[PDB]
Amino acid sequence: ISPPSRAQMKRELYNGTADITLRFTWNFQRDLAKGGTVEYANEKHMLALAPNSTARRQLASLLEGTSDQSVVIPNLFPKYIRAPNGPEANPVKQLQPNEEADYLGVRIQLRREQGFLEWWVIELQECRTDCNLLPMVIFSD
Amino acid sequence: IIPFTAQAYEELSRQFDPQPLAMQFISQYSPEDIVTAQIEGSSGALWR
């Protein structure tokens, strides 16, 4: 992130009352050999980041200097997606009833280990091995 | 990216109204058609 806008991103999470667009685009590029017009089935699962929420205060400290903040993203990792040959990664409703609150609790961890060496691990609220390998599912069509 | 509104479209059309074909392009394209290219210029991405 460009330094001035990184400081502005900081500020948003720090104070700036805005809602960061957390578009979790779930692009599913298939193929065209077996068919699949718009193979890439994509859906930006956005999470408007409430100004300085629990998640954004964790992100405030994340971008302040520390790298030990588990950012709570309220169940936003679709664990069952009815994707077809069109451009939509729409999750199965009922599989995930709330489908925004029944996806899968996802967490984020920026690992700025100055040596800032800013990495970014996508953890889970219950990360067992899903900090390096998140296992969701795509109900393909 | 800003989908230009009806009022915004009028502005562009009037800006280039002297030139007939310029205005024509804008006016012919339906409102909420002409989109705004607000391309980001800030970097951060160093180069390689």
Curated annotation (Swiss-Prot), chain A:
Segments in the Extracellular topological domain:
1-141
Q: Describe the effect of E113K.
A: Found in Er(a-b+) and Er(a-b-) blood group phenotypes
Q: List the disulfide bonds.
A: C127-C131
Residues listed as glycosylation sites in the UniProt record: N15
**What happens upon changing G115S?**
Found in Er(a-b+) blood group phenotype
Report where it is expressed, by tissue: Expressed in numerous tissues. In normal brain, expressed exclusively in neurons, not in astrocytes. In Alzheimer disease brains, expressed in about half of the activated astrocytes located around classical senile plaques. In Parkinson disease substantia nigra, not detected in melanin-containing neurons nor in activated astrocytes. Expressed in erythrocytes (at protein level). Expressed in myoblasts (at protein level).
**Location relative to the cell:** Endoplasmic reticulum membrane; Endoplasmic reticulum-Golgi intermediate compartment membrane; Cell membrane; Cell projection, Lamellipodium membrane
Q: Determine the domain of life of the protein's source.
A: Eukaryota
What's this chain's function? Answer: Pore-forming subunit of the mechanosensitive non-specific cation Piezo channel required for rapidly adapting mechanically activated (MA) currents and has a key role in sensing touch and tactile pain. Piezo channels are homotrimeric three-blade propeller-shaped structures that utilize a cap-motion and plug-and-latch mechanism to gate their ion-conducting pathways. Generates currents characterized by a linear current-voltage relationship that are sensitive to ruthenium red and gadolinium. Conductance to monovalent alkali ions is highest for K(+), intermediate for Na(+) and lowest for Li(+).
Note on file?
A: Piezo comes from the Greek 'piesi' meaning pressure.
In its UniProt record, what illness is this protein linked to? Dehydrated hereditary stomatocytosis 1 with or without pseudohyperkalemia and/or perinatal edema: An autosomal dominant hemolytic anemia characterized by primary erythrocyte dehydration. DHS erythrocytes exhibit decreased total cation and potassium content that are not accompanied by a proportional net gain of sodium and water. DHS patients typically exhibit mild to moderate compensated hemolytic anemia, with an increased erythrocyte mean corpuscular hemoglobin concentration and a decreased osmotic fragility, both of which reflect cellular dehydration. Lymphatic malformation 6: A form of primary lymphedema, a disease characterized by swelling of body parts due to developmental anomalies and functional defects of the lymphatic system. Patients with lymphedema may suffer from recurrent local infections. LMPHM6 is an autosomal recessive, severe form manifesting as generalized lymphatic dysplasia.
Family, per entry: Belongs to the PIEZO (TC 1.A.75) family.
Assembly behavior: Homotrimer; the homotrimer forms a propeller-shaped Piezo channel with a cation-ion conducting pore. Heterotrimeric interaction may occur between PIEZO1 and PIEZO2. Interacts with PKD2. Interacts with STOML3. Interacts with TMC1, TMC2, PCDH15 and CIB2; the interaction may be part of the MET complex. Interacts with MDFIC (via C-terminus); the interaction prolongs Piezo channel inactivation. Interacts with MDFI (via C-terminus); the interaction prolongs Piezo channel inactivation.
Protein name as annotated: Piezo-type mechanosensitive ion channel component 1
Recorded source organism is Homo sapiens
The organism's lineage is: Eukaryota, Metazoa, Chordata, Craniata, Vertebrata
> Which gene is annotated as encoding this protein in its UniProt record?
PIEZO1
Q: Which portion of the entire protein is included? A: 2280 to 2425 of 2521
